[PDB]
Amino acid sequence: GVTTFVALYDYESRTETDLSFKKGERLQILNSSEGDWWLAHSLTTGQTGYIPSNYVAPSD
């Protein structure tokens, strides 16, 4: 059970709860893919936080 995505663009953390990531990073969500902001964990960096769905695309 995973739901994974790859980053299309860099995203710099700007809030207390979001997650910085670089283009090409692999990210997994910790709940469902509903909505526009998802709690994620980066397989690349090990960090976690909310990410914007419009910066990523599904990755098997």
UniProtKB/Swiss-Prot annotation:
Tissue expression notes: Expressed to high levels, and with a high degree of kinase activity, in certain fully differentiated cells such as neurons, platelets and macrophages. Isoform 1 is widely expressed. Isoform 2 is expressed only in the muscle.
Domain SH3: 1-60
Entry comment on modification after translation: The phosphorylated form is termed pp60c-src.
Intracellular or extracellular location(s): Cell membrane; Mitochondrion inner membrane; Endosome membrane; Nucleus
Function as written in the Swiss-Prot or TrEMBL entry: Non-receptor protein tyrosine kinase which is activated following engagement of many different classes of cellular receptors including immune response receptors, integrins and other adhesion receptors, receptor protein tyrosine kinases, G protein-coupled receptors as well as cytokine receptors. Participates in signaling pathways that control a diverse spectrum of biological activities including gene transcription, immune response, cell adhesion, cell cycle progression, apoptosis, migration, and transformation.
Assembly, per entry: Forms a complex with polyoma virus middle T antigen. Interacts with AFAP-110. Interacts with GJA1 and PXN.
Family membership noted in the UniProt record: Belongs to the protein kinase superfamily. Tyr protein kinase family. SRC subfamily.
Protein name: Proto-oncogene tyrosine-protein kinase Src
